[PDB]
Subunit: 494 residues, 4 copies
């Protein structure tokens, strides 16, 4: 039951957010944000750079000073604030879902029922962790009393992508604020509006000034500024596998700040011959096409056992062909446009490459509309491991279907990737499910499902898909600094 959207919601926030106040860039510059559905400019936004980053960091550091309102604050209170911010977001749910769609391209139905529900659940989950992440009392040798304090890491620089603007923001603020850190966030140039509106809600929630600071702008400028700043204690980057390397270098050459990376992937979705055909087909479609195929963990390599390959493909193609593309605000729209022209062209290039390599184009394969960045649901069959489309993250509505015979075979081929973010297995057999979930080198392995993220389930990657984690109790580790206090006592006893 989705409330009717305002297909052209007004933009109330388009500036830099520091100390709970809106500022223009020092350079007084801005940049336009495009509506991927029309190609039209939604509005202008403050273009932050080094100087603005510096303004943000100092404000954060100041809010993190020993004795500040944020530091003395009871941990249970931080939880109270997170729950408050969630209630505000829920109040403005219909608006945010709309604004998210207007700037990202994704279906308003998805933004409301999915994106925003997950935002709410994420913030409410972490609110609960605020006063529940205990330190330890250690039974060290000798007459001593030793314990640990889990203190905040400090000023945390967070750079987030555009595929899930509001959600990525929540996944980062949630653990950081629950553990007492301060944030200097850089949002994507493609989708900065929703994040900024939330910063307004952060102020209304009652968070002390400087606790959360958002700086919209470009990656080479603002992003690198944060990653290089001498006063930033930790930087968390989430995006392309290429930019991540830049960040780890700029961070290790600046002040040895802690660095966590969340990169892309070429996640394998294995369908064994005994899988529920109807279920497998529908999930494999969802596995890839979800969010215009713009998912870090997208099932971009659909491995199918030979005995059921033909039937699977036939059904897959039918599902692709029936997938409705169009205005994200229309309730019947399943797939919206791609985020921007760059990606739009980048995808078309991959499709072209797929054709060049001998991959059998089964459906779609070109522009889906003369206005906006829409691409038809494309499906490539008889894909080989050596093909480009079977190795490089496409990040679009392009499905690759590979055929395999043995289970021993598919494990090797699935694991034969520089990536290892996620993977999935569709089978009715107990042994096969356990065999594969253990053999697959992936941060997350789904059985008879895909893209099932719980605010309580960790999300990390193996190999070059990343390091460290988001969501779950493990998420608190990365934003926590451990101090050991060892006191000399008169005489220790058990």
């Amino acid at each position: 039951a989705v409330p009717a959207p305002n297909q052209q919601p007004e933009v109330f926030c388009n500036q830099i957010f520091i100390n709970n106040e809106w500022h223009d860039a020092v350079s007084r510059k801005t940049f336009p944000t495009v509506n991927p559905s029309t190609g039209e400019v939604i509005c202008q936004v403050a273009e932050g750079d080094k100087e603005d980053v510096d303004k943000a960091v100092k404000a954060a550091r100041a809010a993190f000073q020993l004795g500040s309102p944020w530091r003395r604050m009871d941990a249970s209170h931080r939880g109270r604030l997170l729950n408050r911010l969630a209630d505000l977001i829920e109040r403005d749910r219909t608006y945010l879902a709309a604004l998210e769609t207007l700037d990202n391209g994704k279906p308003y139905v998805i933004s409301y029922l999915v994106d925003l529900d997950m935002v709410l659940k994420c913030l409410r989950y972490y609110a609960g962790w605020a006063d529940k992440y205990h330190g330890k009392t250690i039974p060290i040798d000798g007459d001593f009393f030793s314990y640990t304090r889990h203190e905040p890491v400090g000023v945390c620089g967070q750079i987030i992508p555009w595929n899930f603007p509001l959600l990525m923001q929540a996944w980062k603020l949630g653990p950081a604020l629950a553990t007492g850190n301060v944030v200097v966030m850089k949002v994507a140039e493609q989708t900065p509006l929703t994040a900024l509106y939330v910063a307004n809600l952060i102020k209304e929630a009652g968070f002390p000034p400087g606790v959360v600071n958002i700086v919209p702008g470009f990656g080479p400028t603002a992003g690198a500024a944060i990653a290089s700043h001498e006063d930033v204690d930790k930087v968390a980057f989430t995006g392309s596998t290429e930019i991540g390397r830049v960040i780890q270098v700029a961070a290790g050459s600046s002040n040895l700040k802690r660095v966590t990376l969340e990169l892309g992937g070429k996640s394998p979705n294995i369908i064994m011959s005994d899988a529920d055909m109807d279920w497998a087909v529908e999930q494999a479609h969802f596995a890839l096409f979800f969010n215009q195929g713009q998912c870090c963990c997208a099932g971009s390599r659909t491995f199918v056992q030979e005995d059921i390959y033909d039937e699977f493909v036939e059904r897959s193609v039918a599902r692709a062909k029936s997938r409705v593309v169009g205005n994200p605000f229309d309730s019947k729209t399943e797939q919206g446009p791609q985020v921007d022209e760059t990606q739009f062209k980048k995808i078309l290039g991959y499709i072209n490459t797929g054709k060049q390599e001998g991959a059998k184009l089964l459906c779609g394969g070109g522009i889906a509309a003369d206005r906006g960045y829409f691409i038809q649901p494309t499906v490539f069959g008889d894909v080989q491991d050596g093909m480009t489309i079977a190795k490089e993250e496409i990040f679009g509505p392009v499905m690759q279907i590979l055929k395999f015979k043995t289970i021993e075979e598919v494990v090797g081929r699935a694991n034969n990737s520089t990536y290892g973010l996620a993977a999935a297995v569709f089978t009715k057999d107990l042994d096969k499910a356990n065999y594969l979930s253990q053999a697959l080198q992936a941060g997350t392995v789904w059985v008879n499902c895909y893209d099932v993220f719980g605010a309580q389930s960790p999300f990390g990657g193996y190999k070059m898909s990343g390091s460290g984690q988001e969501l779950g109790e493990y998420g608190l580790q990365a934003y926590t600094e451990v101090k050991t206090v060892t006191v000399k006592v008169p005489q220790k006893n058990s």
Copy 2:
């Protein structure tokens, strides 16, 4: 590769163990311990009573005094001692296995390869916990520093059964000693020898006097004294569902001491139609006949799906008939005699009870030898839910095979019991395995296996099979007391 046994091992310890010294009963009385294989008296053993238990408790309390060797000792050291004890037990492994068999009746091969291996693994596992059970530093509201100390509960009375003499001893000593407690243990009147020998190794390992005190004798006397003692902080009993009630009453009427009970059960072993036949039959046999069927968690209710019922039974009977019964010291022997005359008769009564109710006697059902307490592997088919052999713990080599149709049906029938210790499921289907493992109300649920116990896996029960646990990190909770220290600080900060 099992060493050749000394079929008539010498008995070196047969008295009361207090302050690392051997004492006779104050009454000077003694009782005989019989060799279930021959019906002959192995030797005489000190018959402890309330006065002796008082001696043991006082000794234990002294050893637990603030500032005593055992209280000041580093936690890591306790681990060192546990490991030492394990090394000594392994040194004398061949002997203990023989002595275990002599007094219990179980096959020497099983005592050596199973019983003793599990004792070693148990003690070594717990040795490792000694310095790793941390307390917590709590982020309490206000300007305070709050933390917790995990102190020992104190003088722990432990009453152990005869089905697994050495192992039960290890399961109790392991967690209690690892956490710094002291023990006054009452061993079974039928199998007291091995436990007392181990007490000798306890002194050799270097444990302070009074840390572990063992008192052989009877339950109505020694057992009750421990459970009733005003200075015992906790009592852990393991045995019949009838005596457990006595203990919880004697404990709640004495000094409100903490009480954990490990009782029996009528565990269900469900065999789905798609299960691996060969595997399921062999394991279903083992699930019940193991240790002369003398298992708290024995699979006394073998439910089989109708489509495979006939075949299953036919194979089950064949396996039963081939089961070699005889001298426990002969390598070929699979089943030895029952522990004592009382049980011997108790089982014959149940067998007769089965015949009276209309349960189909498929094999065995009578005495297996004119000397000792040997009983033929017995199997009853077409058993119904209302039958007594289908509700009461027989504790003997008597198998009940029941027939069922749907999965919804078997869950209700399996859960329809006052017991809930264990359960098992044999299937190839993933959904069936998960459905069942979640629906079955049992402390432990095995999938495509049975009687799989790891030193690291907890063992507890639902309903009237018990409360609290043995093994695993959970085992330490029961032997730990939590103290909260809340200090007032100048000014709190994250």
Copy 3:
């Protein structure tokens, strides 16, 4: 900033609560609840008995059935409900505070700023645990996959006291509901009104029918019925050290249900000679006089070092004499009346006994008003360890001040008690604080403060003050049942 109270609030709920519906006792009987400030009857209340309890239990068991709304419900959702219930309580805060005071006697200011604040903080804290109490994946030996599930214990019978009607209710419902259990709660005959009103809020919050059932009545009838019921899985009693024995007996004689007891105590408050005199005096006054001295962890044994004894006592007496007694609804009132006549008389008896034993009466010692159950703030000096007033829980506004010399002395005298609920140390020396905090045998030990309870800090007792705990992560262990599932796998790897 306390809102003006309604000194005679209307009573809307005065019946039994089963399946979110109000019932009359089967016996149609009722009983009066008195206003301790005037001795007047507030209203009649349904008097539940065994038959009513049976109705409640069957309702509870029904709601706990596999597949029910409460069982299938997402853990995070139970959190949502707890938070919702919190919000409702906050809405009607001012009313409940008044009703609390009306039926209990405690000052309205305290009910508003303290009692209800804690009720809210408690429920909100626990709501956060709902989806954060993980099970474990165990690295068991052999080719197996072993894991644990933390399942609800089931039907939880909870019996709560009258000293903190609303708060005790939160402390019990919080952990129970967050872990998915169902409740059959018996409230105090002296203070049943507020609990019954909250039950209305439990319905409004959206909790499935039968998840929480409250049965007002008497302890010998209703209480014993719960404790003895054959279908109650666990019973948690909080009250006098005498009734607790009855409950553990009735429970161990019924169905071996799990039992946790929260009993009284004679908590020692140690004031070292180097303590901040002003602070210590005010905190020691608070430590005992709080809530009309009706605290299980009251500092009823004030030990003072000799060098500062005289000065301390003088100041203590002055503070006592200035302590305002009167109508609980007046801002200037610090101490209201005692809960009922029984206690009122029981306290005067102890006061008379104190004088008989030679304890020096320093102030007060008799009735504070000719109407109600008011007693003057009494202080006894030069109290000796052997005196009755220095051994038995008075549960009233009577202070005992003892003199001591050495720190070794006070530890021995402090630990020389059958109780061990709480203790406190006032000093400026690091070593003295640590020495005492470790040597004192009490569940909680406050340093330079007293009665500091956080919803996150555990509250348990040693010796005969209880077993098990409330609040903190430890509170969840008592309401959780652990199931181990061990799956056979093809081949295990690290």
Copy 4:
């Protein structure tokens, strides 16, 4: 009671360790290792380079292959191995202590009683952790079963210093091996002998070939090879703050492998006016001069309150002057020589610099022997924050004593450093201890003691002293990779 040493122990291992076999460098190259006590060459050692590192890594990856002995091995068994290795090290305790002293310079008495004792305690502590690092079963939303597996990170590159040869190796192998990883370790060119001998014991203990591979050589060559290798999953460096930047750069530019750094520091030891003078003086001496002042966490900034400054300094000077320097093999020797000539001269330079800046030289200040690298115990008084000796890690027997007035002042000055490894506070006041332990920005804060390291207590650093940790439960997080498996189930229930 220390056993008499062999002042010239035979060297049995001086090559590269790969697949439990000794190899020569591919380049057939070697390099000399000096005895810092005489300046004489002990023996020649294989000089490993990139090609050698490649042989090691390939060996490691092979040993880590799914299905390998090391991967299938029971976690409890890895524990067994670690304990076995410790038993072998204890057997050859006397030898290794001598060999450590021979190549390092530290007193044999300290090598035996401290270094080797800590090696044993570390290995045994970790052996215990092998089968106790559980994953989690997560209560995710929806009809799913979600859990985590803590898998090894893979091929671990470890680069260790020379200050504590054996201990540094233990601190690295312990947590890595316990968690199932494989190691390619690079030992210090100054102290490679003991580490290589221990590798011989690793073979004897029974570890699979390739589980631990040691490659002696130079940092620029071997070290950089490891940090840069495309197949190394993680690199852990411990050394100078200069080389650490190089490693994090070479790693983020290679394959985004995980990096943990353990750098130096200028740790503050704060002595309040109420501190136990005798104790504080002796401990402050130990804090800095220990292990020839070669400690990452050395108390190089001794802050003393003015009221006790003069007396403190006097006593400190007297202790320094009495500190015996000489042959590390003579029982009376408290301080041996510095590790090598480079360090020897670097320290003299710092001593010179101290004099140039106006630091008051109170004793020593020059070479302590014409043979070897012995330096006199040096003490500088009236040091200011701005001075070089007050900011840069000297890593030698040079103490800096600073004077302060307020507690608020010392906090700011203590925290005014790029480092944040350790800190200490000597006081008798509770509030002062808590205030300072919380306010000080250091990984470790000792109260009334220094250099107290338990195998169970974590050791990490703030700011530029490092990231990640060694020792304790936290040590396992860095060597663990978390996989989330989320299975679709029929119907979820609590």
